Structure formats: structure tokens, C-alpha cells
Amino acid sequence: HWGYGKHNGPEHWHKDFPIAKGERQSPVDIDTHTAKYDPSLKPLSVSYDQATSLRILNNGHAFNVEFDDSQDKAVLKGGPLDGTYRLIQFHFHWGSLDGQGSEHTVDKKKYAAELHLVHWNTKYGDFGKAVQQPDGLAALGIFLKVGSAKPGLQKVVDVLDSIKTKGKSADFTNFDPRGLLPESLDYWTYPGSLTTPPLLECVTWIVLKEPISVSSEQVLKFRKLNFNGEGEPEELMVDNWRPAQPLKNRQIKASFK
């Protein structure tokens, strides 16, 4: 099935998921000189104070930190969004080396990694229903560069040893995702898709301009994870990113001047 390997990687996905060649696929390159400031964007609201993390799972293509989304706790609203979007999980994409790993690019620059906080529109009742709607999901994307350590990431990095292989999970309660945000909430936004199969075109992307810094030691530990299951030939979980897709008939809007 699909993956990031030599023979099942992003260039192959269209065979099982024809929408891979669709009109609003993600990620994209953000051309900073062409993105236009949009005065109509309302302020972004990230309300994570009541966030309830539950578990961390290696799903064979990334690790997801999963949240309790049975009630309105951690929510994203404002910005380009109408209504309320509930946090369900976050995960990362990263490279084999610091010079690649992000999905979105900025003037073709690739960051070492990219964090995705995934939220679904409560007007559709559940995540499964939401992904079938053009405005079903809101994904907050945050770039990672290598430099100083990110204290708020360390609890994540330290549990990775316990979920090395596909299908392993671990209890992961009381994790505060506010510790992963940069100082500024300046952002770019555009209509897009899931970046993994089924690649559904249901996502409003909100990509923050300010990267967070993580340490070499921290990202090194991401790269010790495995795509494979327990006991199988070791394939390091690295370069689990989809490259930039054609922008087509879309405009990227900036929240800032």
C-alpha cells in the first residue's frame, strides 16, 4: 500500500487515489511575494487551555498525539474560519537531514519538519462526516527549524522510544499543545487537502509564518522511529513528507502586511 518508500511514495498515490491530481491539493509552495494581505481575515483564535491529550500512536506513517474531542475543549476559530473546529490530533512530517522534511515550503525553502494540528468542524458532528465537506477540517501548520531546543516538545520526544514501531501506542495524558506554538500567530491561508491518502479536499490550511526552533537532539529522536512493525526489517521513519503540489486556481492570503 501507500507510503514514502522507493516504490509506493507520493508519485504513486494517484493510482489508488485519483484526487491526488485534483484542483485543491496540499501541500503547496508559499510564494511570499505573491501572497496578498487580506484585511477581511478576522483574528485567529487558538483556545487550547482545556485540551485533553489521551494517547500517542505510531500509525506507520507518522506518530499522532490524540485528543479527547467528544466535547468542545481545544478549539480553533477565527482567521479565515466560520464556526468552531475541534482539535483531534497533531503529528509531524520530517526529513532524513535538516535540509528537508516540511510539506509546505516558503519561497521553495524546505524546513526540517512541520507540525500539523488537525481540527474538525463541529457543524458536521464527527470527523468522518467532516472530511466529506469542503470546509470540514482546519489544519494549523507550524514549521520547525533546528537550533535551540523546544522545551514543550521534550515530553513528546521522550516517549517515542515506547512507540518505535507501527501499531504501538502509549498513554499520553496531560500534554499541553500550547507549548508547541511560536510567539506570533501571523499566517498564510488557502483551501487545500489532506496531505496523506485519501487526500480529501476538505481542509482550510492555516500555515504560521514564524517557525519554532527544536534541537538537533530532538529531531534526531524523530528519526529513530520506524515505518515497519515490530520484528520486521528496520525502515527508519524519515522523509515522511509529501512534496509541494500545483497551486492551480487558488490564492494564498496573508493575515499580515
Min dist CB 189 to Zn ion, Å, is 16
Q: 49-108: which residues touch Zn ion (CB under 5 A)?
A: none
196 in a known ligand binding site: yes
CB of 195 to Zn ion, least distance (A): 5
Q: Is position 7 annotated in a ligand binding site?
A: no
* Shortest distance (Å) from residue 78 CB to Zn ion: 22
Query: By rule CB under 5 A, what count of residues binds Zn ion?
Result: 1
Output 49 or 56, the one with its CB closest to Zn ion: 56
* Closest CB to Zn ion among residues 117, 163: 117
Question: 58 vs 125, which CB is nearer to Zn ion?
Answer: 58
Neighbour tally for 4: CB within 10 Å: 19
- For residues 116 and 150, which CB has a smaller minimum distance to Zn ion in the complex? 116
What is the closest distance, in whole angstroms, from the C-beta atom of residue 197 to Zn ion in the complex? Answer: 12
Nearer to Zn ion, 116 or 119 (CB): 116
Copy the grid coordinates of residue 37: 494581505
**Options 116, 166, 209, 221; binder of Zn ion; rule CB under 5 A:** 116
Residue 110 binds to Zn ion (criterion: CB under 5 A): no
State the chain's maximal CA–CA distance in angstroms.
54
From CA 141, how far away is CA 189, in angstroms rounded? 10
Name the residue number minimizing CB distance to Zn ion: 116
> DSSP readout, the chain?
---SSTTTSGGGGGGT-GGGGSSS-S--EE-TTT-EE-TTPPPEEEE-TT--EEEEEE-SSSEEEEE--SSS-SEEEETT--S-EEEEEEEEEE-SSTT---SSEETTBPPSEEEEEEEEEGGGSSHHHHTTSTTSEEEEEEEEEESS--GGGHHHHHHGGGG-STT-EEE--S--GGGG--S---EEEEEE--SSTT--S-EEEEEESSPEEE-HHHHHHHTT-BSSPTTSPP-B-----PPP----S---EES--
Stretch that binds Zn ion, among 3-11, 17-25, 65-73, 110-118 (CB under 5 A): 110-118
Query: Among this protein's residues, is 1 annotated catalytic?
Result: no
For Zn ion, which stretch binds (CB under 5 A), given 11-19, 49-57, 115-123, 220-228?
A: 115-123
**Residues forming the annotated binding site for Zn(2+)?**
91, 93, 116
Instruction: Cite the annotated binding site by residue number.
Output: 91, 93, 116, 195-196
Active site (catalytic) residues: 61
- Point out which residues bind Zn ion (CB under 5 A): 116
